[PDB]
Each structure stands twice: as structure tokens, then as C-alpha cells.
């Protein structure tokens, strides 16, 4: 129960229009052989080109939808979920017809640039009809598991010019994809074609009829099945960037913003709606803290009418509501909100289904599409740093800080002390880290930082 057995059956029905006469009885072992690959009883970490659904989910950062549409004398259109379309000749980025020896070079360049900061491998996500599997021998080479010639990462590319192997970071000028993975979505038990199944859940990807459109719809449908309709928050993903800093920044911003709203507007009660594991972000606040459980929505954003109504203080209008990563359709006017913006471009955020995005930071979270109208009763929360801690350096070099948003006793009394200048700059860094990761902060309209200066009287 580790890898997908080569002796597992492969339903070949989807393959019979490009490959008429294909045997109904078929295994992975016979399919790989038919694709032109020899596995030679090799016990070297590459037991099968095809992988299980569970392995595909653990390597979601490696997913690249691939589709081949025909144009012996058949020129092929090679579509990738990066939006790239290459034309191979036997001899929405649309490239003219070229022979395989140059096409394979462009393929290694594209996958290397797309994946070097995401994953140690490639997973071709297919809706297999025939031509994509038969085309693989023209750009893929297989063998035992290898390491890069320039480093210790696993080898993902091969060069017939130098006879060496490279990872995605060192494969400049390499021509073959080495030991790729693949999964046929059509093997999951679907009725109807790709578009009919895709269009049931997503109105964002259309069918222009080019190979890359299908490659996009395939990866999208695969993401919906594995992360929208089925959610598994137990699967851990490796650290590939600023994960730890972003998470630390998020907890610092939360404490700061909630601590200041309770000081400025002195709400008697706070309704904390979201994560059933949540802890009081401001443990020393006077306020009555009431929790309401709601797991992260992955399909559509929660309707505020279902979260609140149907008969808890019952009066959510009393006090303030804290929606920290709790994605609802329209926030009530008395709210403190942290909403992830799915449009953000990063190595942590991968494209999702129906405008949503798959945010992968320790765990995978499909987030519904960012909608500006959710925030009509609120305003954008401005940057501010508040601190009531004593001015005492205790224990890096200095330049005097001058800022209208440093809300401290020292700034009230004229000059900012070294301690609050160091802490203000660290907090500004954490804030910029969090904003740039895609998170966006919103607050009730009466929120004024001018009300914080009187907490120094």
C-alpha cells in the first residue's frame, strides 16, 4: 500500500478513439510497455510512471495538466496547464510547428521554470485519450532514481549532449524530462467527457478548443475532486518558502489589531467565528470572548444568514465579530476581518477551481474566489503599530524613527524610544510579509487609531 502497482488494471475505454482496437484488459505494466518504455525489473525508487490519487495529493505542487490534440504525418498540439501550446511535427500561448528535438528543449525549460520553487518532481495530470501517452517517448526518458550533477536534489531532467542529469534549478540546455509522474483522471470513474464534468463546478475556465484549455480543465477538475469535494487537513506539505514567517506574522497582526479595537471601541463582547481550534488572540483583554465553530470553507463562501440565523449571545449585532480567515459572503458592519486574496501570485498559492485558489502552507486549503463585495459594510484596515509596553531598550544598530503610525507613549511625548523603534520596524516587516502573502485586512468604519492615544492618560 505504498506506490501504485504496475499490475493494477487500467480502463482503456477513453483511449479507444485515438487507439482503435485497444485491449479492454490492460495493466499499468502493459500500458508503460506500449508507451515505448522498458522498466527492466528495476528496484530503484521509480516503481511506476503512474501514481495513486493519495500520492498525487501529497505532490499537488508538482501538478501540470497535459493534453495532446492531433492537427505518421500527424502534427500534434501539446498543451500544458501553464497555458502553453507547442506544435510538434514528424518532419493561450500558440507556437508554430517545429520538430521534436527543439520541442523537447522548450518542454524542459517550461517545466523547470514553473516548478523549481514548487517541487522536486512533475506530475502530468491527464484526461487520457491516446496521443498524450504515445507522445511521451518523444520527450521523456526513464531509469533509476538519480541526483543532480550540480547538487543533491533528485534528478528531473536529462541531457543527451553531456550525458548528465539535473534538477529543475540546474537543467539549462537539457532536452529530456527524466522520471516524470502521471495520473489519468479518467480512471477515477466519471460519466461523460472532460468539459461536461469540469463545467459542473467551474465557470472560470472555458473551452477555446486548444490543447492547453483541456490541460487547464483537467488540472482544475483534479483539484476540485481532491481539495474541494474531499478535504484532508492531515496531509503535511514541505517548507518551500516563507511559510514560518508568514504564519508568525499573521498571529502578530491578529493580536495587534484585535487588542487595538477592544481598546479604541471598548466592546463588551467579541464573537469569534471560525477555526474550532482557536484560542483567544488577546488573552488579557477585558471583553466576553464567545467562540463559534466553522471549518475553512473550500467550495463556496459561507452565507452569513446560515452562520448567524436559525436561532451564543444570539445578538451578533452586540459587540464585535472576529472573522479571522473565515470566508463569508457579506461581513456584518461590526467586524474585524482577515480574508485571503486568492488572486495573489506566490509559490504557496496555486491556481484553483471556479476562481478559487489552493493555498498550500503546511496544509492545503482550497479558498473560494476573492469577492470585493463581501466587504461593503467595512473599510480597508490601515497600517498602525500600537504598544503600551514600557520604554526600555534591554540588551543591531539604530536610526531615529519618525512616524505618525507608531502609537506609543514615547511618540505621544515627542521622541520615539529605541525599544519601540525596533519593535515598530519588526512589526512593519511582519505586516508587509502578511500583506504580500495575499492576506487582506478589513475593519468596521468607526475604527480610528486616534482613539488609542487616550490609553496613555
Ligand X SMILES: CNC(=O)C1(Cc2ccccc2F)CC1
**Residues recognised as catalytic:** 67, 69, 132, 209, 214
Q: Figure out which of the listed residues 4, 60, 84, 88 binds ligand X, where binding follows CB under 6 A.
A: 88
Q: Of these, 16, 89, 285, 412, which contacts ligand X (CB under 6 A)?
A: 89
108 lies in the binding site for ligand X (CB under 6 A): no
Is 321 marked as a binding-site residue? no
Of 74 and 94, nearer to ligand X (C-beta) is 74
Other beta carbons within 10 angstroms of residue 352's beta carbon come to 25
| 271 assigned ligand-binding residue | no
Report the residue number, 104 or 420, with the smaller CB distance to ligand X: 104
Partner from ligand X, Zn ion, none binding residue 261, C-beta < 5-8 Å depending on class? none
Q: Contact at 8 Å (CB) between 336 and 328?
A: no
Residue in 56, 60, 64, 76 binding ligand X, rule: CB under 6 A: 76
CB-based contacts of 286: which residues, under 8 Å, 6+ apart?
262
Q: CB of residue 112 vs Zn ion: minimum separation in angstroms?
A: 10
Task: Write the binding mask 196 to 235 for Zn ion: x where contact by CB under 5 A, - elsewhere.
Answer: ------x--x--------------x---------------
- How many residues touch ligand X under the rule CB under 6 A: the total is 17
Is 275 labeled as ligand-binding? yes
Residues 413-442, interacting with Zn ion (CB under 5 A): 417, 420
98 touches which of ligand X, Zn ion, none (CB within 5 to 8 A by kind)? none
Name the one residue in this structure whose C-alpha cell is 477592544: 262
Among ligand X, Zn ion, none, partner that 2 touches (CB below 5 to 8 angstroms by kind)? none
- x-or-dash string of contact with Zn ion, 137-156, rule CB under 5 A: -----------x-xx-x---
Which residues on neighbouring strands pair with residue 86, listed in sequence order?
Answer: 78
**Looking only at residues 16 through 75 of this chain, which bind ligand X when binding is defined by CB under 6 A?**
19, 22, 31, 34-35, 72, 74-75
**Grid-cell match 484532508, residue found:** 232
215 interacts with, out of ligand X, Zn ion, none, CB within 5 to 8 A per kind: none
> Among 110, 248, 391, 435, which residue interacts with Zn ion (rule: CB under 5 A)?
391
> Are the C-beta atoms of 53 and 61 separated by less than 8 Å?
no
Site for ligand X in 115-154 (CB under 6 A): 130-131, 133-135
Q: Rule CB under 5 A: which residues touch Zn ion?
A: 148, 150-151, 153, 167, 170, 202, 205, 220, 391, 408, 410, 417, 420
Q: Rule CB under 6 A: which residues touch ligand X?
A: 19, 22, 31, 34-35, 72, 74-76, 88-90, 130-131, 133-135
Amino acid at each position: 500500500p505504498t506506490h501504485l502497482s504496475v499490475d493494477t488494471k487500467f480502463k482503456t475505454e477513453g483511449l479507444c478513439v485515438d487507439i482503435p482496437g485497444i485491449p479492454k484488459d490492460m495493466t499499468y505494466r502493459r500500458l508503460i510497455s506500449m508507451m515505448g518504455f522498458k522498466m527492466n525489473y528495476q528496484v530503484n525508487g521509480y516503481p511506476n510512471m503512474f501514481i495513486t490519487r493519495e500520492e498525487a495529493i501529497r505532490h499537488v505542487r508538482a501538478w501540470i495538466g497535459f493534453d495532446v490534440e492531433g492537427c505518421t504525418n500527424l502534427p500534434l498540439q501539446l498543451g500544458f496547464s501553464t497555458g502553453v501550446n507547442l506544435v510538434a511535427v514528424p518532419t493561450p500561448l500558440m507556437y508554430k510547428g517545429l520538430p521534436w528535438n527543439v520541442v523537447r528543449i522548450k518542454i524542459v525549460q517550461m517545466l523547470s521554470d514553473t516548478l523549481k520553487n514548487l517541487s522536486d518532481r512533475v506530475v502530468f495530470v491527464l484526461w487520457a485519450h491516446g496521443f498524450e501517452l504515445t507522445s511521451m517517448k518523444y520527450f521523456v526518458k526513464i531509469g533509476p532514481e538519480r541526483t543532480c550533477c550540480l547538487c543533491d536534489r533528485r534528478a528531473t531532467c536529462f541531457s543527451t549532449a553531456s550525458d548528465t542529469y539535473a534538477c529543475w534549478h540546474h537543467s539549462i540546455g537539457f532536452d529530456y524530462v527524466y522520471n516524470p509522474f502521471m495520473i489519468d483522471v479518467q480512471q477515477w470513474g466519471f460519466t461523460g467527457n472532460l468539459q461536461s464534468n469540469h463545467d459542473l463546478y467551474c465557470q472560470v475556465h472555458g473551452n477555446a478548443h486548444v490543447a492547453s484549455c483541456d490541460a487547464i480543465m483537467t488540472r482544475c477538475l483534479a483539484v476540485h475532486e481532491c481539495f474541494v469535494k474531499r478535504v484532508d487537513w492531515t496531509i503535511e506539505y514541505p517548507i518551500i518558502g516563507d511559510e514560518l514567517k508568514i504564519n508568525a506574522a499573521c498571529r502578530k497582526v491578529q493580536h495587534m489589531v484585535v487588542k487595538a479595537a477592544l481598546l479604541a471601541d471598548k466592546f463588551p463582547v467579541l464573537h469569534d467565528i471560525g477555526n474550532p481550534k482557536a484560542i483567544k488572540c488577546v488573552p488579557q483583554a477585558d471583553v466576553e470572548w464567545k467562540f463559534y465553530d466553522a471549518q475553512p470553507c473550500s467550495d463556496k463562501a459561507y452565507k452569513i444568514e446560515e452562520l448567524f440565523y436559525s436561532y451564543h449571545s444570539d445578538k451578533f449585532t452586540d459587540g464585535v465579530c472576529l472573522f479571522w480567515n473565515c470566508n463569508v459572503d457579506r461581513y456584518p458592519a461590526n467586524s474585524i476581518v482577515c480574508r485571503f486574496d486568492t488572486r495573489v501570485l506566490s509559490n504557496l498559492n496555486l491556481p484553483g477551481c471556479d476562481g478559487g485558489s489552493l493555498y498550500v502552507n503546511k496544509h492545503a486549503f482550497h479558498t473560494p474566489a476573492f469577492d470585493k463585495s463581501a466587504f461593503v459594510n467595512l473599510k480597508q484596515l490601515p497600517f498602525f503599530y500600537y504598544s503600551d509596553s514600557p520604554c526600555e531598550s534591554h540588551g543591531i544598530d539604530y536610526v531615529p524613527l519618525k512616524s505618525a503610525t507608531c502609537i506609543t507613549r514615547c511618540n505621544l511625548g515627542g521622541a520615539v524610544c529605541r525599544h519601540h523603534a525596533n519593535e515598530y520596524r519588526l512589526y512593519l516587516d511582519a505586516y508587509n510579509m502578511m500583506i504580500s502573502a495575499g492576506f487582506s485586512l478589513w475593519v468596521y468604519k468607526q475604527f480610528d487609531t486616534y482613539n488609542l492615544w487616550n490609553t496613555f492618560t
